[PDB]
Design a protein around this ligand. Structure first.
Ligand SMILES: [Mg+2]
Ligand SMILES: [Mg+2]
Ligand SMILES: [Mg+2]
Ligand SMILES: [Mg+2]
Ligand SMILES: [Mg+2]
Ligand SMILES: [Mg+2]
Ligand SMILES: [Mg+2]
Ligand SMILES: [Mg+2]
Ligand SMILES: [Mg+2]
Ligand SMILES: [Mg+2]
Ligand SMILES: [Mg+2]
Ligand SMILES: [Mg+2]
Ligand SMILES: [Mg+2]
Ligand SMILES: [Mg+2]
Ligand SMILES: [Mg+2]
Ligand SMILES: [Mg+2]
Ligand SMILES: [Mg+2]
Ligand SMILES: [Mg+2]
Ligand SMILES: [Mg+2]
Ligand SMILES: [Mg+2]
Ligand SMILES: [Mg+2]
Ligand SMILES: [Mg+2]
Ligand SMILES: [Mg+2]
Ligand SMILES: [Mg+2]
Ligand SMILES: [Mg+2]
Ligand SMILES: [Mg+2]
Ligand SMILES: [Mg+2]
Ligand SMILES: [Mg+2]
Ligand SMILES: [Mg+2]
Ligand SMILES: [Mg+2]
Ligand SMILES: [Mg+2]
Ligand SMILES: [Mg+2]
Ligand SMILES: [Mg+2]
Ligand SMILES: [Mg+2]
Ligand SMILES: [Mg+2]
Ligand SMILES: [Mg+2]
Ligand SMILES: [Mg+2]
Ligand SMILES: [Mg+2]
Ligand SMILES: [Mg+2]
Ligand SMILES: [Mg+2]
Ligand SMILES: [Mg+2]
Ligand SMILES: [Mg+2]
Ligand SMILES: [Mg+2]
Ligand SMILES: [Mg+2]
Ligand SMILES: [Mg+2]
Ligand SMILES: [Mg+2]
Ligand SMILES: [Mg+2]
Ligand SMILES: [Mg+2]
Ligand SMILES: [Mg+2]
Ligand SMILES: [Mg+2]
Ligand SMILES: [Mg+2]
Ligand SMILES: [Mg+2]
Ligand SMILES: [Mg+2]
Ligand SMILES: [Mg+2]
Ligand SMILES: [Mg+2]
Ligand SMILES: [Mg+2]
Ligand SMILES: [Mg+2]
Ligand SMILES: [Mg+2]
Ligand SMILES: [Mg+2]
Ligand SMILES: [Mg+2]
Ligand SMILES: [Mg+2]
Ligand SMILES: [Mg+2]
Ligand SMILES: [Mg+2]
Ligand SMILES: [Mg+2]
Ligand SMILES: [Mg+2]
Ligand SMILES: [Mg+2]
Ligand SMILES: [Mg+2]
Ligand SMILES: [Mg+2]
Ligand SMILES: [Mg+2]
Ligand SMILES: [Mg+2]
Ligand SMILES: [Mg+2]
Ligand SMILES: [Mg+2]
Ligand SMILES: [Mg+2]
Ligand SMILES: [Mg+2]
Ligand SMILES: [Mg+2]
Ligand SMILES: [Mg+2]
Ligand SMILES: [Mg+2]
Ligand SMILES: [Mg+2]
Ligand SMILES: [Mg+2]
Ligand SMILES: [Mg+2]
Ligand SMILES: [Mg+2]
Ligand SMILES: [Mg+2]
Ligand SMILES: [Mg+2]
Ligand SMILES: [Mg+2]
Ligand SMILES: [Mg+2]
Ligand SMILES: [Mg+2]
Ligand SMILES: [Mg+2]
Ligand SMILES: [Mg+2]
Ligand SMILES: [Mg+2]
Ligand SMILES: [Mg+2]
Ligand SMILES: [Mg+2]
Ligand SMILES: [Mg+2]
Ligand SMILES: [Mg+2]
Ligand SMILES: [Mg+2]
Ligand SMILES: [Mg+2]
Ligand SMILES: [Mg+2]
Ligand SMILES: [Mg+2]
Ligand SMILES: [Mg+2]
Ligand SMILES: [Mg+2]
Ligand SMILES: [Mg+2]
Ligand SMILES: [Mg+2]
Ligand SMILES: [Mg+2]
Ligand SMILES: [Mg+2]
Ligand SMILES: [Mg+2]
Ligand SMILES: [Mg+2]
Ligand SMILES: [Mg+2]
Ligand SMILES: [Mg+2]
Ligand SMILES: [Mg+2]
Ligand SMILES: [Mg+2]
Ligand SMILES: [Mg+2]
Ligand SMILES: [Mg+2]
Ligand SMILES: [Mg+2]
Ligand SMILES: [Mg+2]
Ligand SMILES: [Mg+2]
Ligand SMILES: [Mg+2]
Ligand SMILES: [Mg+2]
Ligand SMILES: [Mg+2]
Ligand SMILES: [Mg+2]
Ligand SMILES: [Mg+2]
Ligand SMILES: [Mg+2]
Ligand SMILES: [Mg+2]
Ligand SMILES: [Mg+2]
Ligand SMILES: [Mg+2]
Ligand SMILES: [Mg+2]
Ligand SMILES: [Mg+2]
Ligand SMILES: [Mg+2]
Ligand SMILES: [Mg+2]
Ligand SMILES: [Mg+2]
Ligand SMILES: [Mg+2]
Ligand SMILES: [Mg+2]
Ligand SMILES: [Mg+2]
Ligand SMILES: [Mg+2]
Ligand SMILES: [Mg+2]
Ligand SMILES: [Mg+2]
Ligand SMILES: [Mg+2]
Ligand SMILES: [Mg+2]
Ligand SMILES: [Mg+2]
Ligand SMILES: [Mg+2]
Ligand SMILES: [Mg+2]
Ligand SMILES: [Mg+2]
Ligand SMILES: [Mg+2]
Ligand SMILES: [Mg+2]
Ligand SMILES: [Mg+2]
Ligand SMILES: [Mg+2]
Ligand SMILES: [Mg+2]
Ligand SMILES: [Mg+2]
Ligand SMILES: [Mg+2]
Ligand SMILES: [Mg+2]
Ligand SMILES: [Mg+2]
Ligand SMILES: [Mg+2]
Ligand SMILES: [Mg+2]
Ligand SMILES: [Mg+2]
Ligand SMILES: [Mg+2]
Ligand SMILES: [Mg+2]
Ligand SMILES: [Mg+2]
Ligand SMILES: [Mg+2]
Ligand SMILES: [Mg+2]
Ligand SMILES: [Zn+2]
Lengths: 122, 131, 204, 59, 118, 63
RNA sequence: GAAUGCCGGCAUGAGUAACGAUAAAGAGGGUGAGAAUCCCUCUCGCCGUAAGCCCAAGGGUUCCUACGCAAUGGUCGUCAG
RNA sequence: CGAUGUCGGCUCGUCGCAUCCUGGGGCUGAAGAAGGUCCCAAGGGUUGGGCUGUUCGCCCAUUAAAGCGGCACGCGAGCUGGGUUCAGAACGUCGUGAGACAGUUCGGUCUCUAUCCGCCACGGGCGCAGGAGGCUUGAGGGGGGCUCUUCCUAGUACGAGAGGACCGGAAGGGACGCACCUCUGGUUUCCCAGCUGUCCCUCCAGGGGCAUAAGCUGGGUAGCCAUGUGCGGAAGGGAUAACCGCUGAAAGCAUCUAAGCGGGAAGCCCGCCCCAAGAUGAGGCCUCCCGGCAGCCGGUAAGGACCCGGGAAGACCACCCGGUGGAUGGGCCGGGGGUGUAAGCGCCGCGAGGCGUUGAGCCGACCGGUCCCAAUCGUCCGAGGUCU
């Protein structure tokens, strides 16, 4: 459950540390982004000399949510933070690696690069 | 009519009897059927059970682990056909039913607050002696 | 246009192809046909069905004469299924097969005198910033001198629920004949113990 | 609010028509099988103190 | 909505309602029969029956449970020694409510008697 | 593209229900200009044409 | 017949709003024509730098007792300033 | 002018069409895709945010689109009171001055009770020529009406290429709506446990009150809920709009039209969902009832009402279930569920405590069982059927 104003950890090494969602890219008025959804966000904190800098307006895909995610098999999964991987206009990761686990929901939505780069797919 | 027994009847066909008993606080390994592309495989999820929500067949439980630096919680239906098996890897003794509080605890504090449950461990060793 | 009378017993989920599917269990049969409506007699086609067995001691003489004329023991509820004429004298869950789609009619839960927010999802008012005793009020109900009245059908507070609701195109997940149980995917109007009607769906 | 007020005196007709629902219903009474006094049903008879054909109350 | 909610409020907050029942229970168990409003009487039954049922059990624990509500040692002595034996073969239904014919003058309240069964 | 709206600030009732302020935005140039001095919308629109002539005379001068 | 006229009487709103701190009541016994409301007993709650006690100002018999309940008491009243 | 409250916001909308999107179409300087322009079309939809009191406007990120207007530039006996229109104070300016400014600046009391119409709900009465218990027909009315992306067709038609379809299929979303509580997640006022201070019971142990109208904390069933689950927009049939035609004169040719016929929209009429015979035009079907003097009196029939135990029904009323030939509520019993190993005793420790007995004890609503308690006993209404 990500929405505008929501801060996300960025789980890549593009250099961004925290971004703030400013739109969820799912039609004209989606209220919330969940795992596998794309957002537009502002970069609020970033480490020096990264590929991205503070103030940049980026796109990202949500790879972890603190609101639990429900699966058709009746199970669910939930993480300690809300996290995203910053992407380009082709839904490809702008970083070389991704940190921490990511949700398997990513696979079916066409984020294979990210899924393979992740240390664990849960 | 007995509406409850009717529901119990419908549920009876889907009930599991092969899974071991555990309590909130135990450390458990859950072998889960997982789908990747066109194949199925087994993926193990091991962590502390922090909650068992009882409603007969509709019982579910929650397992928490730290994964590559990130807290993760999975909620499993106790009778899901997707669970290959559950392995008891350790018995912990808690003094309450819901262990939400461990979410805010260091690893050291968790280990301190959740002491090894020596009674239920000894019991385990008493079984696994087959005649 | 097949249909049967039933009672809502409760909800569960079953597992089907590694999927949890939510269901309401319905005790539908068995229903004796206690009168048939014909075009020649009644101007239309239907079957009056009975459900559940009733204590004769509570059934007055007029009802009894109606029961007696048909070959049937006294029953708690009589209801017609329109444009249905079963060949048999009794309708059971056997009329539905897993995979068929059904419309289910029941009486929704009553909320009694309901507010404009609960009834109609109105926005109410702010809970601070000076808002004065109108946190859950409807706001304006009109204009001014033109038209100087309130429209018929204005959404306002009043009784809500305990009314006939039909949910359409529900999947029959299972039917269990030895128990007269119907499993329908998803949610059915009304309380457990509630009386419902199950019909072949009008959706294509 | 702005202190709503009656626009017109209510006529004798309309006032009285409003009271068309105000008449009392007489109390519902049954004879007490013991002492035959009238009393409300499902209460202990206050006249002899019997209920369900047995003595309950001192009179 | 009150759907399937059990228990009366009796226009009292949590602790007053509690103190009401205890006090009435004390009163009932002392005199064996009291008069109260119909709703107070109806609500009272279950509360006292439970206390009596513990007295039928007789053990130290039950005595301590009942003591939480009744508070008075002597009354509980009476509960266990004198009252409890009369119900040893009776399973529940230790109290009885019967409605009175005349209402209270000042507020029209319908009254009832509540009494321990023989 | 002449825009009209209500004046801002003091005036009383005859400033709350009156669109007395004007704004003349030139479409190709992108130059905007407003006025709100006098109570009349067209005594202001007179001014806004005047000032608008001035802004184009500035730009065509700057070329 | 009118002066938002003057005085008095009686209506409408209406058996409607309200009955004036959310500190809280319950039972048994007595008195009495009449008792949720008066007396007594037990239980429960509230105050306790007071919601207890003493003094001054002001009030002016409200103090005590006996006999009473038309009116005063926002209900009742056998009780009472 | 013996008062018609004045901007903006909020809430709730409704209407118009000179249509922003979606649907249909003509022309195109229309290859394709994408546009431009005009015609039909008001069914539905028409985002979040930065700035400013702002309407307006600019900007950010999107979108199928971010339409324009009416309704006292809708809506203050519905809310707000930031802006304007009081009394204070200050700046700039004007005036010798008191003071003044469509100049600015900080501050500044928005009134519990709805009589009538209107509207949302719910009843009481009488009517529907005999009286009753059920089940219905649907005149009429309301609700609903949105849309995107991806894949297949097919990298085919078109095209130098870059690009890239019509038609027809398939999958998945956004917002909205109805219902629901299995799952997820809330609340859960005393369901359980832990804790402090104090007073008390009874000294220890064990408990009780109070700290809120739960003292605090950790949890928490049912119920009520969304963030959670299911389902809906249709399909299809009919008549049309613009438009495209077939046949075809007046007018030897020609013309979609003058006689005829056809195709053709998210629109209209049906279809779906809900209300509905006060539809006084009061409908239909099934069953039950049969003495005194177009009236009146009494006692009854079919049946109903009262009274009582109650209910995911409910403000009262109504509705629904049950009333001893009964499981309706309370108790009790079993299960579920919550809490999480009670008291007591024993053992270890100087002690705080620990361990065992023990998943113990307590235990609201849920699913049932059990006549133990209470629905005792009863009472009153209620046909005798208008005429051709
Ligand atoms: Mg956060
Ligand atoms: Mg910076
Ligand atoms: Mg910077
Ligand atoms: Mg990390
Ligand atoms: Mg159930
Ligand atoms: Mg082990
Ligand atoms: Mg451990
Ligand atoms: Mg750990
Ligand atoms: Mg199956
Ligand atoms: Mg209700
Ligand atoms: Mg409301
Ligand atoms: Mg609603
Ligand atoms: Mg709502
Ligand atoms: Mg709703
Ligand atoms: Mg709305
Ligand atoms: Mg809002
Ligand atoms: Mg608001
Ligand atoms: Mg709100
Ligand atoms: Mg205010
Ligand atoms: Mg408030
Ligand atoms: Mg009008
Ligand atoms: Mg209703
Ligand atoms: Mg479907
Ligand atoms: Mg006010
Ligand atoms: Mg009002
Ligand atoms: Mg007047
Ligand atoms: Mg009046
Ligand atoms: Mg009269
Ligand atoms: Mg009169
Ligand atoms: Mg309600
Ligand atoms: Mg209710
Ligand atoms: Mg409430
Ligand atoms: Mg109940
Ligand atoms: Mg009650
Ligand atoms: Mg209350
Ligand atoms: Mg009250
Ligand atoms: Mg309290
Ligand atoms: Mg207790
Ligand atoms: Mg009574
Ligand atoms: Mg001025
Ligand atoms: Mg003006
Ligand atoms: Mg005069
Ligand atoms: Mg004159
Ligand atoms: Mg006069
Ligand atoms: Mg006078
Ligand atoms: Mg008067
Ligand atoms: Mg009056
Ligand atoms: Mg009244
Ligand atoms: Mg009134
Ligand atoms: Mg009132
Ligand atoms: Mg009242
Ligand atoms: Mg009051
Ligand atoms: Mg009142
Ligand atoms: Mg007072
Ligand atoms: Mg009061
Ligand atoms: Mg009180
Ligand atoms: Mg007495
Ligand atoms: Mg006496
Ligand atoms: Mg007394
Ligand atoms: Mg105190
Ligand atoms: Mg002190
Ligand atoms: Mg003095
Ligand atoms: Mg004086
Ligand atoms: Mg004196
Ligand atoms: Mg005296
Ligand atoms: Mg007096
Ligand atoms: Mg008197
Ligand atoms: Mg008086
Ligand atoms: Mg007074
Ligand atoms: Mg006296
Ligand atoms: Mg005195
Ligand atoms: Mg005026
Ligand atoms: Mg006037
Ligand atoms: Mg609205
Ligand atoms: Mg047009
Ligand atoms: Mg179009
Ligand atoms: Mg075109
Ligand atoms: Mg084209
Ligand atoms: Mg055109
Ligand atoms: Mg439209
Ligand atoms: Mg419209
Ligand atoms: Mg529109
Ligand atoms: Mg906007
Ligand atoms: Mg703003
Ligand atoms: Mg603005
Ligand atoms: Mg601002
Ligand atoms: Mg502006
Ligand atoms: Mg932008
Ligand atoms: Mg206005
Ligand atoms: Mg104007
Ligand atoms: Mg106008
Ligand atoms: Mg306004
Ligand atoms: Mg108004
Ligand atoms: Mg007005
Ligand atoms: Mg203010
Ligand atoms: Mg101001
Ligand atoms: Mg200001
Ligand atoms: Mg003044
Ligand atoms: Mg000067
Ligand atoms: Mg001077
Ligand atoms: Mg002046
Ligand atoms: Mg001024
Ligand atoms: Mg101030
Ligand atoms: Mg000011
Ligand atoms: Mg106001
Ligand atoms: Mg009225
Ligand atoms: Mg009127
Ligand atoms: Mg009626
Ligand atoms: Mg007549
Ligand atoms: Mg119709
Ligand atoms: Mg009509
Ligand atoms: Mg319609
Ligand atoms: Mg291909
Ligand atoms: Mg091919
Ligand atoms: Mg197509
Ligand atoms: Mg297509
Ligand atoms: Mg769809
Ligand atoms: Mg939704
Ligand atoms: Mg549940
Ligand atoms: Mg739940
Ligand atoms: Mg939950
Ligand atoms: Mg719950
Ligand atoms: Mg308790
Ligand atoms: Mg407590
Ligand atoms: Mg309890
Ligand atoms: Mg201390
Ligand atoms: Mg204590
Ligand atoms: Mg003592
Ligand atoms: Mg102690
Ligand atoms: Mg105390
Ligand atoms: Mg207190
Ligand atoms: Mg506090
Ligand atoms: Mg709590
Ligand atoms: Mg919770
Ligand atoms: Mg939701
Ligand atoms: Mg959908
Ligand atoms: Mg023609
Ligand atoms: Mg056609
Ligand atoms: Mg169509
Ligand atoms: Mg459509
Ligand atoms: Mg009907
Ligand atoms: Mg109907
Ligand atoms: Mg009729
Ligand atoms: Mg009829
Ligand atoms: Mg009731
Ligand atoms: Mg009945
Ligand atoms: Mg009876
Ligand atoms: Mg029996
Ligand atoms: Mg029972
Ligand atoms: Mg029972
Ligand atoms: Mg358990
Ligand atoms: Mg222990
Ligand atoms: Mg122990
Ligand atoms: Mg020792
Ligand atoms: Mg139990
Ligand atoms: Mg039996
Ligand atoms: Mg009787
Ligand atoms: Zn008697």
């Amino acid at each position: 459950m990500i929405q505008p104003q929501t801060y996300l950890e960025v789980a890549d090494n593009t250099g961004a540390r925290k971004i703030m969602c400013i739109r969820v890219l799912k039609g004209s008025n989606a209220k919330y982004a969940t795992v596998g959804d794309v957002i537009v966000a502002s970069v609020k904190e970033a480490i020096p000399r990264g590929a991205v800098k503070e103030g940049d307006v980026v796109k990202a895909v949500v790879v972890r949510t603190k609101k639990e995610i429900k699966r058709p098999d009746g199970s669910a999964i939930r993480f300690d933070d809300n996290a995203a991987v910053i992407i380009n206009n082709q839904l490809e990761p702008r970083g070389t690696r991704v940190f921490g686990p990511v949700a398997r929901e990513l696979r079916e939505k066409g984020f294979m690069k990210i899924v393979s780069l992740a240390p664990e797919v849960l | 009519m007995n509406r409850g027994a009717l529901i119990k009847l419908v549920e009876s066909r889907y009930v599991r009897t092969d899974l071991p008993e555990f309590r909130p606080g135990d450390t458990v390994r859950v072998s889960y059927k997982v789908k990747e592309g066109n194949r199925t495989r087994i993926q193990d999820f091991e962590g502390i059970v922090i909650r068992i929500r009882r409603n007969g067949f509709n019982t579910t439980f929650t397992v928490r682990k730290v994964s590559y630096g990130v807290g993760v919680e999975r909620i499993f239906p106790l009778h899901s056909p997707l669970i290959q098996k559950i392995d008891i890897v350790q018995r912990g003794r808690a003094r309450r039913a819901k262990l939400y509080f461990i979410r805010n605890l260091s690893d050291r504090e968790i280990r301190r607050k959740l002491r090894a449950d020596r009674k239920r461990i000894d019991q385990d060793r008493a079984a696994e002696r087959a005649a | 246009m097949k249909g049967i009378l039933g009672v809502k017993v409760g909800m569960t989920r079953i597992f089907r192809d590694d999927r949890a599917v939510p269901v309401t269990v319905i005790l539908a049969g068995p229903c004796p046909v206690v009168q048939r409506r014909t075009p020649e007699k009644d101007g239309y086609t239907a079957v009056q069905l009975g459900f559940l067995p009733q204590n004769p001691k509570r059934v007055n003489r007029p009802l009894k004469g109606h029961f007696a004329k048909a070959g049937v023991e006294p029953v708690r509820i009589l209801r017609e299924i329109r444009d249905f004429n079963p060949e048999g004298d009794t309708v059971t869950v056997e009329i539905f097969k897993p995979g068929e789609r059904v419309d289910v009619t029941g009486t929704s839960k009553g909320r009694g005198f309901a507010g404009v927010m609960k009834r109609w999802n109105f926005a109410g008012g702010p809970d601070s910033h000076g808002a004065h005793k109108i946190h859950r009020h409807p706001g304006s109900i009109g204009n001014r001198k033109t038209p100087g009245r309130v429209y018929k059908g204005k959404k306002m507070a009043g009784h809500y629920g305990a009314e006939r609701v039909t949910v359409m195109n529900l999947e029959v997940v299972d039917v269990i004949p030895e128990e007269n149980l119907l499993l329908v995917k998803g949610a059915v109007p009304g309380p457990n113990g509630g009386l419902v009607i199950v019909r072949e769906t009008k959706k294509a | 609010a702005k202190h709503p007020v009656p626009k017109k005196k209510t006529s004798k007709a309309r006032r009285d028509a409003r009271r068309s629902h105000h008449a009392l219903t007489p109390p519902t009474l049954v004879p007490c099988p013991e002492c035959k006094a009238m009393k409300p049903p499902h209460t202990v008879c206050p006249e002899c103190g019997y209920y369900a054909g047995r003595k309950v109350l001192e009179v | 909505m009150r759907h399937l909610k059990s228990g009366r409020k009796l226009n009292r907050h949590s602790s007053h309602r509690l103190a009401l029942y205890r006090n009435q229970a004390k009163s009932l168990l002392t005199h064996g029969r009291i008069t109260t409003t119909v709703p107070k009487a109806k609500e009272l039954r279950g509360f006292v029956d439970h206390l009596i049922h513990l007295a039928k059990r007789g053990d130290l624990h039950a005595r301590r449970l009942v003591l939480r509500d009744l508070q008075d040692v002597k009354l509980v002595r009476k509960l266990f020694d004198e009252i409890a034996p009369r119900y040893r073969d009776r399973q529940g239904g230790y109290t009885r409510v019967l409605k009175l014919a005349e209402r209270r003058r000042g507020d029209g309240a319908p009254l009832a008697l509540v009494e321990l069964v023989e | 593209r002449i825009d009209v709206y209500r004046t801002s600030g003091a005036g009383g009732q005859h400033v709350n229900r009156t669109e007395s302020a004007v704004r003349i935005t030139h479409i190709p140039t992108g130059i905007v200009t407003q006025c709100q001095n006098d109570r009349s919308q067209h005594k202001n629109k007179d001014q806004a044409m005047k000032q608008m002539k001035a802004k184009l005379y500035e730009v065509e001068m700057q070329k």
